[PDB]
Each structure stands twice: as structure tokens, then as C-alpha cells.
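Anyone able to model this chain together with alpha-D-glucopyranose?
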Amino acid sequence: GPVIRVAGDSTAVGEGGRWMKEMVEAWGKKTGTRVEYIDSPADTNDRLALYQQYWAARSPDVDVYMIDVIWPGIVAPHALDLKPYLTEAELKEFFPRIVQNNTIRGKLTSLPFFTDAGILYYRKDLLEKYGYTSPPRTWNELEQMAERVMEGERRAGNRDFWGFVFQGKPYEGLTCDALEWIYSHGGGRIVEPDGTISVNNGRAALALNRAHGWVGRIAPQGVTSYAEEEARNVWQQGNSLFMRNWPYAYALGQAEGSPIRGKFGVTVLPKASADAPNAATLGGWQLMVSAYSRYPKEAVDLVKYLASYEVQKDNAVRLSRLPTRPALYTDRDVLARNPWFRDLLPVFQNAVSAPSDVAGARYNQVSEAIWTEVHSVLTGRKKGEQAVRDLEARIRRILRHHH
Ligand SMILES: OC[C@H]1O[C@H](O)[C@H](O)[C@@H](O)[C@@H]1O
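re: yes, here you go
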């Protein structure tokens, strides 16, 4: 019979690839359908380039892809329209915001699978050790706490200890981190939903200068090459007071044998001042049936299974990844394992999107300009003032004539 082939997630990032292959094999076994899992690189922008090779070729060699929240506008021609396969009731079991994100010119490109939001991880043991009763609410507090804890821990002999780790590598994750910095300083959304390129302002510049101020000071010098896993590994070994990262790192940090099990909490990222908005960049992954699949009916059945209540539940319980079904956020088992899903639900609801809707199919070019200009500030090559001016000019060129 048919072999249903899936490219989604990565064995190079936590347990995602392993768990994904597990779920796909379970569907295979339950339905009597042969399946194959194709692995992907860690970073989303590398995955896009890979999958683009299959799409350009109209390749039938992958039936189902896991696609980023930022991709629907790019990948829509390569997606089978799922709308005819779901009832209105079925489709309403997902968050409307994500279904809308995934719907391009009326085409439902993909089902919501898991959502994502950037959050602050913090070592509760260390805050208590150094006299702090709450995680930081402002970036200045984060810096003050990081400096004091680092001084103490370095003095006690942990030469590997840092204050803060994050994603500073030149790739999509830096765009995510940087949107949070900018937005949390009152600097806007880089490109606003209405099309306005707003990033050339003093608040955005300050946010970038502040981040440069971390590098080699409270954050490792090598943070400028860190993606999600590099940051997680320093944190997870016990060597960072703070980390910015996504939900998936929670379950990994709690696993038996983690040096930091039971020593950490999560909260909203800090912000410049009390009246700035809270920033959490909206991430997440969706399930797309290939327009080039020879087996659309079977592939849709697999995508419905993967997006089902019980598979999303497993993803939440075992991998601490955020459901795209509101009903899971009241599930007793999801909540007992991850109580912070309830505490931070409003953070997740107010998460801020990168400018993929407004940039559409040119989003990957916009984002590359963003991470390259931000990176040049993190390296000390440019000041924030110059970088946001240069970034405005690049984005203007990229989006000229885009409506
Ligand atoms: O590295 C950036 C990526 O991180 C996570 O995978 C998010 O879910 C995704 O939306 C984002 O693009």
C-alpha cells in the first residue's frame, strides 16, 4: 500500500524529532499504513530551504510537512487546501487566531499543531540564595540580578557560570529574540500590521544597544552563535541564572538526570518599564499536506490524528509544548504536569507576531535583514541607532511594491 512520508521537526532539537517519528509510527500502526520519517535540520530557516527543494521539484517524496507559523504566506502554493476536509465544528476546536494565521487567500494551508511563545526561565534556588524573592520584571532588574549572582557563583568557583543565555546566532531565532527586545522597550513590531516600517526609532535602538551590553558581560561572548539548543545546554547544565527560550525546554530541564530539575520556574520576559508592553514572540508549528502528495486522503487522516486532542495532550505532558486546542488548557493532567500553562496563558494569548502576515511571501527576506542588522549590533560592529536606520532602508527595499 501507500508509504506516507513525513518531514517535520528535528532530532537535533530536544525530543521533537524522536517524538514526532513516534507519533507518525503510531498512526501507521493504528491504521495499517506504512510510514517513513524524514529528519530535518535544527533551525527553521534551514528547514525552509530544504523543503523548498522538494517544493520546487513538485516532489511526491514527502506527503506531510511541519511548517512554521511564519510560513503560510510563503508555502501556500505547495499546500493542499484542508478546508474541505474539516467541518466548521472541528476547525473551531483550534485557536481562531492560528487557524486565521494558517489561512491564506481562503486556503487553509495547515492545521495548528503546537503554538509557542518566548518566555523567561529562571533559577529559583539562585534567586533565593542571593536574596531575591521574585524574577525580574524589568530588563534593568534582570541585569542587576545577573551581575550579582554571577559575581557570587564565579567566586564560589563555577567558571562556567553566566547571568543570561538567549538566541544570538544569525538566523530566525534572533529575529524572534529581537522582536521581544524591541517591543518590550515600546519600540514597535519592526514592520507594523498596516505595513508601516516603524523600526527606526530611539526605543528600538535602545533595545538593541541594551542587548549588545549583555554580550561577554552577563551573557557569554559565544551567545552570538547560540540557537535554541546552545542556550538550553548552558542553562540545563546549571550554568545560567536566566534563559530566554520556548516552552519545550521546561520538560527537558525537569527530566530525571537534569542537573537543574526542580530548581527553576518560568515567567513573562522582562520589559523596559512598567508601562511598556509585555513581549513574547508568537511561534509554533502547523501540519501541511503537500500539494504534490499522491496520497491526499491518507495524508489528511495522518494530519488530523497528529493534531487531535490526545496527540496534542501527549505533546503537552511529555514535551511541555503548547496546545493549539483551548480545551487542553483546562485538562487536569496537562495542568498538573505544567501548572505554568495556566499562569502564563495570557502571555501566550498576547504574544506578538513577527511580521510574516504583512510581509507575506517575502517574510524570509525581511527576517534575514532583521537578524543580520541585529547581529551586527550584538557583535559591536554597529550601534543600535545606525542599525535601525540601515534596517529600515533594507526593509523598504525588500517590501517596495509588495501589497
Ligand atoms: O528559531 C525560531 C523558531 O523557534 C521555534 O521553533 C518557534 O516555534 C518558531 O516559530 C520560530 O520560528
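The radius of gyration is 21 Å.
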